[PDB]
């Protein structure tokens, strides 16, 4: 497998030597996913998992990396006989992709915690026989590249990974598990999930990677965590530098989440002469609008979290409103629980905490407060409108009474005189999409909000207590 030109940079003695390797591979016809994932996993093992003995950087010797490479390629070539699966015309078959998926799956440790850190790379697969969910999909794509199957590529939503292949790259196959206690669907298409308009499959507006984007995925998959309180500065630096390399070559253009990740790293440690974090967050949103029909949630969540961290209440509320405007056109389905948890935490923890602090600061005489800005009240209302509209037509409900007390409290953080300025109109001015918010319009301007009436309108509950 390893060609002479792939070996000339070893040993890798620094962050910068690893970046040089990535640069060299990204300059080749096709970057070697197996080589690159092994190198990252090796470096991550000795910078985050076991730093005993570390003095600067874990030197990656060719003999060591080549031996791991050979273990991988021997395992895949011996287990997958290509003669059994004839390939017409640069196109792999569903049976072949399933075989490769089975070889990876069947190699894993019988029992292990699937939620651990540092089990994403081919280094983990070879040395520990352990992979996380998305790691299995990446490993299938790396195995397929090692086999010469140029048409097999990684597909990514915001919470899941699978593969595309076949004539025109138009076929889809599940190759790993999703979540905890869901039933395998390995071998099947993603068409039911697309048709049901779940967030998990993005209404079909998911990422179809080329090889360079598969390199970007492995970079985003670097985990600098040493423990709950400490990150590896070395791995943060490596991730940041590799992301800029990919950015400069054009390979983040269609990868919103990578752009957000890069923006986050720039906020932590700015690189002189590069774009500000805000510019990068906006670029991520633009990517989602340009390539994915503005059907992604996380570009707006990335932006909102940045404003939240910086206590920009107005801009945080606007970005969460924008978040909800995306989700409103989805149906909440069985395996979408991660995005429900995110909306729940924003509505019922994050926004309440932000508004509580804003209330204290207003008491102390703050000027230009979000709490005195009717446009901010309108953003709060748009946030809840999008969540209510999301619920419409969904097979599983979203709202319940455990949301209602937080809604009443948040509404109440704006005085009646501020709330009155927003004009709610039918199809500061706001239009509601959801039937639940339309029915609540009446209640939104009283000096003291009617808590019980709000609760009734937000929830399926239609009666009050009997006695």
């Amino acid at each position: 497998g390893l060609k002479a030109a792939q070996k000339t940079l070893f040993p890798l003695r620094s962050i910068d030597d690893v970046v040089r390797l990535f640069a060299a591979e990204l300059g080749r016809e096709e970057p070697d996913l197996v080589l690159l994932s092994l190198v990252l996993g090796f470096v991550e093992h000795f910078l985050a998992v076991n730093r005993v003995g570390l003095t600067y950087f874990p030197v990656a010797d060719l003999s060591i990396i080549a031996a791991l490479y050979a273990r991988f390629t021997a395992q895949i070539r011996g287990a997958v006989d290509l003669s059994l699966y004839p390939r017409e015309g640069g196109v792999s078959s569903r049976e072949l992709v399933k075989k490769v998926s089975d070889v990876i799956w069947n190699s894993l440790s019988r029992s292990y915690f699937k939620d651990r850190a540092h089990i994403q790379s081919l280094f983990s697969f070879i040395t520990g026989t352990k992979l996380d969910s998305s790691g299995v999909a990446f490993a299938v794509v790396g195995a397929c590249q090692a086999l010469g199957l140029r048409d097999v590529h990684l597909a990514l939503s915001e919470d899941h990974a699978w593969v595309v292949f076949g004539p025109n790259g138009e076929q889809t196959a599940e190759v790993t598990w999703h979540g905890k206690g869901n039933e395998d669907r390995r071998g099947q298409t993603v068409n039911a999930g697309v048709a049901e308009r779940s967030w998990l499959y993005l209404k079909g507006s998911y990422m179809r990677c080329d090889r360079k984007m598969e390199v970007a995925f492995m970079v985003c998959a670097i985990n600098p965590s040493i423990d709950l309180h400490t990150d590896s500065l070395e791995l943060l630096q490596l991730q940041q530098k590799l992301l800029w390399l990919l950015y400069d070559l054009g390979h983040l253009e269609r990868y919103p989440m990578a752009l957000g990740n890069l923006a986050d790293l720039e906020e932590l440690e700015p690189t002189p002469g590069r774009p500000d974090p805000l510019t990068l967050y906006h670029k991520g949103i633009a990517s989602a609008k340009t390539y994915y029909r503005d059907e992604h949630i996380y570009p707006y969540m990335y932006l909102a979290d940045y404003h939240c961290r910086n206590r920009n209440v107005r801009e945080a509320l606007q970005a969460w409103a924008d978040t909800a405007t995306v989700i409103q056109d989805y149906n909440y389905c069985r395996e979408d629980e991660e995005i429900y948890k995110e909306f729940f935490e924003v509505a019922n923890d994050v926004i309440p905490n932000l508004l509580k602090e804003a209330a204290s600061l207003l008491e102390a005489g703050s000027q230009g407060s979000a709490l005195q800005d009717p446009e901010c009240f309108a953003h709060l209302l748009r946030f809840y409108d999008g969540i209510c509209k999301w619920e419409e037509g969904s097979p599983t409900p979203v709202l319940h009474v455990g949301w209602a007390t937080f809604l009443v409290q948040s509404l109440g953080r704006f005085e009646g005189q501020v709330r009155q300025k927003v004009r709610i109109v039918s199809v500061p001015v706001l239009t509601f999409q959801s039937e639940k918010m339309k029915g609540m319009k009446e209640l939104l301007v009283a000096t003291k909000i009617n808590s019980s009436a709000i609760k009734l309108q937000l929830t399926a509950q239609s009666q009050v207590q009997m006695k």
């Binding site: 699937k114 939620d115 651990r116 850190a117 089990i119 994403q120 996380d132 969910s133 998305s134 915001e158 919470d159 899941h160 995925f217 985003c220 998959a221 989440m257 990578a258 957000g260 990740n261 986050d264 996380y298 969540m301 990335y302 979290d305 991660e338 995110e342």
Partner: peptide, 10 residues
């Protein structure tokens, strides 16, 4: 623990 690569937040 484990988070999906490049998901926002902590």
């Amino acid at each position: 623990r484990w988070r999906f690569p490049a998901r926002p937040g902590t």
